[PDB]
């Protein structure tokens, strides 16, 4: 009985580092500030807020697997007299989370790490190392229009005799009205959330 | 200014509290509708000339329980009917059932179910009728 309370209290203590590393929050909060650096703004919109909008989105999609953890563990059928079936019982409790990490991690890196069905302890760095790599692909892709904007504004300035002026000023309006008329703020956020759940 | 020729009450999306407040003059007693039975709504043209049968028919089409204790009319919905099993010590059921007929709290829709000369019986009704019968029977047996 008292081992269940120290285990839940240990989960409440470790909960910021698990949501900081283990779940899909790293796909959100990286690519959010990737757009701000793509636009060239430094402190706008002040990333304390942008971490908030990345947290409510990542919690909204992690919560259904978290709800499975209740209905497996709040029941009264936990009394197994032999300790190995109780061990396999709580193995099968985390099976939805383990299945989610297996769904989103690369295969051969996991078996390289458990070379030292797979253990949840081994695939955990293999999830994040693939996740930042998947965040940089859409970091490169979302950056890619604005370098075309940054070159075309210099070409029209060099077509004029305006070569002493830096083109950052004429680059910056069209590097954001090509974002709001495109409406990438609802396009990216909906595209990022449709990757996991289905409506 | 108010053109309708007859006598009646027209309700347009009335929430079962302003409707039963309008029946509180044809019925000569104030009506008290609970919190769960005040979420339902009603519309239409109604006509109050014999409300003790109109309230009975509307309580069955809508699903409602009501009670009249001589000074007010309590109205609940059907999902608030509660149950109670109380065992009397030294007073019979026919003696307790004669006290209710002498007082005036006897309702033939929800009578007391039990043996005619015993202590145990079964009551089920509105939450003010159950709370009155259970409380008065134990203070009659502790008295005797």
């Amino acid at each position: 009985n008292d081992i269940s309370l120290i285990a839940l209290l240990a989960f409440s203590t470790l909960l910021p580092f698990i949501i900081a590393s283990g779940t899909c929050f790293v796909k959100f909060s990286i690519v959010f500030v990737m757009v701000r650096n793509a636009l060239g703004l430094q402190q706008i919109p002040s990333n304390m807020t942008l971490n908030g909008v990345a947290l409510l989105l990542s919690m909204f999609v992690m919560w259904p697997i978290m709800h499975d953890a209740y209905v497996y563990f709040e029941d009264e059928d936990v009394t197994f007299n032999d300790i190995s079936s109780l061990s396999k019982h709580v193995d099968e409790g985390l099976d939805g989370y383990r299945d989610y990490l297996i769904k989103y991690s690369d295969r051969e890196l996991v078996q390289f790490f458990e070379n030292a069905k797979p253990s949840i302890f081994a695939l955990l760095p293999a999830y994040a190392l693939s996740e930042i790599k998947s965040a940089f692909k859409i970091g490169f892709y979302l950056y890619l229009p604005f370098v075309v904007v940054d070159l075309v504004v210099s070409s029209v300035l060099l077509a004029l005799g305006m070569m002493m002026m830096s083109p950052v000023t004429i680059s910056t309006p069209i590097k954001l009205v090509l974002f709001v008329a495109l409406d990438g703020w609802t396009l990216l956020s909906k595209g990022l959330i449709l990757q996991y759940m289905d409506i | 200014k108010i053109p309708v020729t007859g006598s009646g009450f027209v309700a347009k999306d009335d929430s079962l509290r302003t409707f039963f407040d309008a029946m509180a003059l044809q019925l000569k007693e104030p009506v008290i509708v609970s919190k769960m039975a005040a979420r339902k709504k009603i519309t239409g043209n109604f006509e109050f000339h014999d409300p003790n049968a109109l309230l009975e028919k509307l309580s069955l089409q809508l699903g409602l329980i009501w009670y009249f204790d001589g000074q007010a009319i309590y109205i609940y919905d059907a999902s608030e009917m509660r149950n109670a099993v109380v065992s009397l010590r030294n007073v019979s059921l026919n003696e307790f059932n004669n006290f209710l007929k002498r007082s005036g709290l006897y309702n033939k829709n929800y009578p007391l179910r039990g043996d005619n000369r015993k202590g145990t019986f079964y009551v089920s009704g509105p939450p003010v009728y159950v709370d009155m019968v259970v409380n008065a029977a134990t203070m009659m047996d502790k008295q005797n």
Partner: protein, 88 residues
């Protein structure tokens, strides 16, 4: 009569998490039986009278209490070490 079970069962482990998890189940099964066998010693009121079986029930409390207090504070330090390094 009495009855002991001579055969203890074992299972192969391949990873590192199951080695922790069998300690997790071994402590939850240790505390679940030791919360109960001293209460059955208290609820049987012939066992609460003799000083011999009072002294063995005296020391079974101290065995339970020092064990669960030890595994609390070791885990408090174990998560404190994950806490400070990631705070930096």
């Amino acid at each position: 009569g009495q009855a002991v079970n001579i055969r203890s069962m074992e299972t192969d482990i391949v990873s590192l998490d199951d080695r922790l998890l069998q300690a997790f189940s071994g402590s939850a099964i240790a505390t679940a039986v030791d919360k109960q066998t001293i209460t059955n010693r208290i609820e049987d009121p012939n066992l609460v009278t003799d000083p011999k079986e009072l002294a063995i029930s005296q020391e079974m409390i101290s065995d339970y209490n020092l064990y669960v207090s030890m595994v609390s504070t070791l885990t408090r330090k174990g998560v404190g070490a994950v806490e400070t390094l990631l705070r930096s």
